[PDB]
Design a protein around this ligand. Structure first.
Ligand SMILES: CCOC(=O)N(C)c1ccc(N)cc1
Lengths: 300, 237
């Protein structure tokens, strides 16, 4: 298990670590998060108590370095940093653990939620969507726009998700206009899977990362991308059976984790009704359809 | 965006534009079969593509053979329409290509947008005008060429005959829409109005009779009366 120590907590803040969250008071003796499960990416996120518009966080993998958080009073945020001195880092963590100044990552043993939400998410793929090559971890916040949002403004601070546009020459073969518009299989299988993503695992990884960014940071463009990647599959008549079965599992755990009270801001009525009841795959997502109908019947 | 009464003079400015009406593309008769089921029989149709400034009508005749062995014909008809309008644009010299295509039915927007992806600077717009272009097939010479067709064909007409020698395109379009609305509302009476007087004829190279200016005023009044008469009959007014 790995540890993200905090130098201090000078401003009151709600800290998230993956699907968990806890409140830290102004100048409370908080010095980090221990017992973080090795083997998964993680996200540590922040929402300031005195200013809820400050929503930002960091994706990281403890296998890639020793990371800590320190508040910057000039930029007014908690910053992730890497500590290259291993023995210094260990010495800091040990002192904080001995004084019990850390919260423990509160993973129930029965509980596969985080694995189920990040099965296909890799840190290397995150670092290509979020471009800041000098760090091993990736900063995301509420307001970051996507490359596609910027085409319809600072490019360095953007989310480089794969652009999906159903009325684009990439999506529509000349001479196959009706075919490709009513059946997105060409666009899914040849353009996206064979061409850009290379395999379904990378496609699902980006889909999963988009969902998590939208939910944890209230990022609109991430929400748009998640829905577009769902709709591209559901609107394709020809999808490998293993991908349909895996998508059903991916979406089930996403809908299960979504806060009940955020459904008005995280779920697109049009897309979900189209996907579950009108699309080629309307009968292929049995688990997702069942949880959606029992948890968010209003949306449908 | 959408084309309505506020921006109506835009139809007659110097930006080339076309209306596309697909109502008469897929046309059927419905009938009982020997076993007492119901079947359709397609008949020849047409795409009505009109430049409202010049009167140029590109009438693409849709021969029933294009439906043979196809499914979901009402859906296919929209896409065939879009395919044919796209092909027409590509066939025109650059300086004749439209800057805007206005579709009379919003279901044509996505098919036309998708077929015109190669022309990002041609705007595809709906309209809030209720235009009576479905009644094109009430114009005898148009109906005749459509029904006689044995193969796909494009036929070029000027739907204003020679009116623009005497009136503006705004007025010509108003006259056309009044005539077509009247033909749509009561075709027999409208045609009686247009042909009642044997001494006024349709030139070989025209669609409508050769009315003088004063006769057009009379005709237009008779068409408005027909429309109002039929409204009163319909709604018991
Ligand atoms: C701040 C809460 O809103 C969200 O979490 N989403 C994803 C969102 C939804 C809609 C809009 N316009 C912008 C953002």
């Amino acid at each position: 298990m790995n540890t993200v120590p905090f130098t201090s907590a000078p401003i009151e803040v709600t800290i998230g670590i993956d699907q968990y969250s806890f409140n830290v008071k102004e100048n409370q003796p908080f010095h980090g998060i221990k017992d973080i499960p090795i083997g998964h990416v993680h996200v540590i996120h922040f929402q300031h108590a005195d200013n809820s518009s400050m929503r930002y966080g960091y994706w990281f993998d403890c296998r890639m370095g020793n990371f800590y958080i320190q508040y910057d009073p000039k930029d007014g945020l908690y910053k992730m940093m890497e500590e290259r001195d291993g023995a210094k880092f260990e010495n800091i963590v040990h002192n904080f653990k001995e004084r019990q100044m850390m919260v423990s990552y509160p993973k129930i043993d029965e509980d596969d939620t985080w694995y189920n939400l990040t099965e296909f998410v890799q840190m290397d793929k995150i670092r290509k969507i979020v471009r800041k090559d000098e760090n091993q971890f990736s900063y995301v916040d509420s307001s970051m726009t996507t490359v596609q949002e910027n085409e319809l403004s600072d490019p360095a601070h953007s989310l480089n998700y794969t652009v999906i546009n159903f009325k684009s020459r990439e999506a529509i073969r000349p001479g196959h206009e009706m075919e490709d518009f009513l059946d997105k299989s060409y666009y899914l299988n040849t353009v996206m899977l064979q061409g850009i993503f290379k395999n379904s695992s990378n496609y699902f990884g980006e889909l999963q990362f988009a969902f998590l960014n939208a939910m944890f940071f209230g990022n609109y463009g991430s929400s748009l991308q998640w829905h577009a990647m769902i709709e591209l599959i559901c609107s394709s008549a020809t999808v490998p059976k293993h991908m349909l079965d895996k998508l059903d599992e991916i979406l089930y755990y996403q809908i299960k984790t979504l806060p009940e009270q955020y459904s008005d801001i995280l779920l697109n009525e049009r897309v979900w009704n189209i996907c579950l009841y009108s699309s080629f795959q309307k009968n292929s997502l049995h688990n997702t359809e069942k949880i959606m109908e029992n948890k968010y019947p209003e949306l449908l | 965006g959408a084309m309505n009464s506020s921006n109506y003079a835009e139809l007659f400015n110097n930006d080339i534009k076309l209306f596309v009406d697909d109502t008469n593309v897929y046309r059927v008769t419905v009938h009982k079969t020997f076993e007492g089921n119901v079947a359709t029989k397609a008949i020849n149709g047409c795409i009505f593509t009109l430049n409202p400034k010049t009167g140029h009508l590109f009438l693409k005749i849709i021969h029933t053979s294009v439906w043979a062995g196809q499914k979901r014909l009402s859906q296919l008809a929209k896409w065939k329409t879009a395919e044919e309008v796209s092909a027409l644009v590509r066939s025109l010299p650059k300086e004749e290509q439209p800057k805007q295509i206005i579709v009379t039915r919003k279901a044509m927007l996505d098919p036309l947008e998708v077929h015109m992806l190669d022309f990002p600077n041609i705007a595809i717009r709906p309209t809030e005008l209720r235009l009576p272009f479905s009644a094109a097939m009430s114009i005898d010479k148009l109906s005749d060429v459509v029904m006689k067709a044995t193969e796909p064909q494009m036929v070029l007409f000027n739907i204003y005959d020679d009116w623009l020698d005497r009136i503006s395109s705004y007025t010509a379009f108003s006259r056309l829409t009044l005539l077509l609305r009247a033909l749509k509302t009561n075709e027999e009476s409208a045609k009686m109005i247009l042909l009642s007087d044997p001494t006024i004829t349709i030139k070989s190279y025209h669609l409508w009779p050769s009315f003088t200016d004063e006769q057009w005023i009379t005709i237009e009044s008779q068409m408005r009366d027909l429309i109002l008469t039929e409204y009163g009959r319909k709604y018991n007014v």
